[PDB]
Every structure is written in C-alpha cells, then in structure tokens.
Design a protein around this ligand. Structure first.
Ligand code: SAH
Length: 272
C-alpha cells in the first residue's frame, strides 16, 4: 500500500505532466539567480541550474577530485537527472536509478533509449530501503542523488535507507540531497536538526547544508507550475496535477512565512 500510494501520485501521461512541470519533468523546484539563465526562466532552466549549483557545492567543478565511475539516483522521477549526469560524466559507464513508480521507470527506459543511454543507465523497481539488492557490491557509488524524495519516507524508512546506503558509498564519495523540511516544531491550526542527525549518526560527514532554493524561488517555481496547469488544463486538472495546483498557493504562503524551506544537504563518506 506504501508503494501503491506513491504509484498513484506519479501515475498519468508524462506528456500531460510536461505541460505542468516542464519538458525535463524535473520535480524538486529551481533557482532563478543563475547569471546564465535568460529571463523568462522556465521550470526546466530553474530545475537544472539548481542541480548544477548542488554539484558545484559538492565540489564537482574542481578537476582535482576522483573519477566518477558509478552514480546512483534514489527516486529517479522521469529520468532527466540521470540523462544530464550521463552527458556531464561521459566516461561514467554505470548510472543506476531506483524508483517505486513503474510508469516513471517505463518513461525513463524509453527516454534514455531514445538518447542512446540504455547501456549506461540501469533502472530498477527498488525501494530506497532495499538498496542492499543493487548489483555489483564490488563497485561503490562515487555520487548519490536524493532529489525531493525523503519527504515521502517515514522516519524509520529514512534511517534504514541511509544505513543501507552508507556502506555502498566509496570513502570520499558525495551524497547530494534536496528535501522540503519544516522550520517550525509545532502543530499550527522532519526538521533540519533531525534530518542532519540521521546522516551524521550513520557516519556521513556534513559537507554543505543551506536553504536552496530560496523560499521565494520555491514559491516562484510552484506559482509558475500553477499558471502552467491553469493555462494547459483550463477545464480542470485531476489527481496529482490538481493537488499541485492547490498545494502551490498553500505551500508558497508557508514559504513566504518561512514555515518551511527546501534545503541542499551534501554529505561525504569520510576517507578513513
Ligand atoms: N521509497 C522510495 N523508494 C524509491 N523511490 C521512491 C520512494 N518514495 C518515493 N520515491 C520516488 O521519489 C520521487 C519523488 S519526486 C522527485 C523525482 C526526481 N528526483 C526529481 O528531482 O525530479 C518519485 O520518482 C517517487 O516515485
């Protein structure tokens, strides 16, 4: 039922999703402050510049760092992050994606194949808590992406997932996380502290943690996706797209009030 509830969330025609969240189908917000972004900044542009800023903060614009031989994308959505990483790391011959959504994985497979990446990118129906089942234990991960996923995890699944992940990360390896955390510890009519503590308790060293994108940039992404749904589905969106259209206002209000932020959380497995 856990996986059924996530399958329902991300089900529906990817071609419909494109009209709402952009052609790249990236679904963890974006940054609007990149000097390379020419206004008006699209959801696609905001989303990929946000990911590029995360990789910059994780040290991947420095050439004096180890070769990236193996990549994991935990909760790989509609597969654009894996496609981007295959082009950014053209000598990386193994990029693994895990997802519980069969419809997203079926789209990922077709999208990657179209781009000649079917043999470099491996896609698994695999819950983050079962990552011990990923093949080739001899090849640790140099780079792990967890972009807008852990919000779907009960605390126990988050802890077990990070415990499972840690042993499979190469010492010196980077885990690049984006999640939507609460700044307020009360019921009003995961916190940064708890979120960070799970990673450090696991044995990861904190490398960089910050609000990113800014509250106003997350609000802009949400209100732009809302405008997209209202323009492209004037007669009514349904399921997750209608929920997104409604959540956009309430979440944007929470963001302006600083009740919630999106955090860039980059940890490393220590070279010990
Ligand atoms: N327990 C779990 N194990 C694996 N993937 C999960 C998961 N719970 C949620 N997911 C996946 O996490 C994703 C959340 S949406 C984010 C998608 C992508 N990382 C992006 O940045 O666009 C979805 O693809 C969802 O199916």
């Amino acid at each position: 039922d856990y996986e059924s509830k996530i399958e329902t969330t991300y089900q529906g025609d990817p071609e419909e999703w494109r009209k709402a969240i952009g052609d790249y189908l990236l679904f963890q917000f974006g940054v609007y402050d990149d000097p390379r972004s020419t206004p008006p900044i699209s959801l696609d542009e905001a989303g990929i510049r946000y990911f590029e800023r995360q990789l910059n903060l994780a040290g991947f614009d420095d050439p004096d760092r180890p070769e990236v031989e193996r990549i994991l994308d935990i909760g790989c959505g509609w597969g654009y992050i894996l496609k981007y990483l295959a082009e950014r790391f053209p000598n990386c011959m193994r990029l693994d994606g895990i997802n519980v959504s069969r419809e997203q994985l079926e789209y990922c497979a077709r999208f990657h194949a179209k781009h000649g990446l079917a043999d470099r990118i491996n896609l698994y129906q695999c819950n983050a808590q079962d990552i011990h089942l990923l093949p080739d234990h001899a090849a640790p991960y140099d780079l792990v992406i967890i972009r807008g996923v852990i919000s779907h995890f009960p605390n126990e699944l988050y802890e077990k997932s990070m415990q499972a992940l840690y042993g499979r990360v190469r010492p010196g390896g980077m885990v690049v996380i984006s999640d939507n955390l609460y700044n307020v510890d009360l019921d009003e009519y995961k916190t940064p502290k708890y979120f960070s503590q799970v990673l450090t308790d696991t044995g990861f060293k904190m490398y960089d943690m910050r609000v990113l994108p800014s509250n106003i940039d997350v609000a802009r992404w949400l209100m732009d996706s809302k405008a997209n749904i209202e323009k492209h589905f004037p007669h009514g969106a349904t399921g997750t797209l209608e929920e997104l259209r409604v959540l956009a206002e309430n979440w944007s209000v929470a963001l302006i009030k600083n009740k919630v932020s999106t955090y860039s959380v980059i940890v490393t497995r220590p070279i010990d």
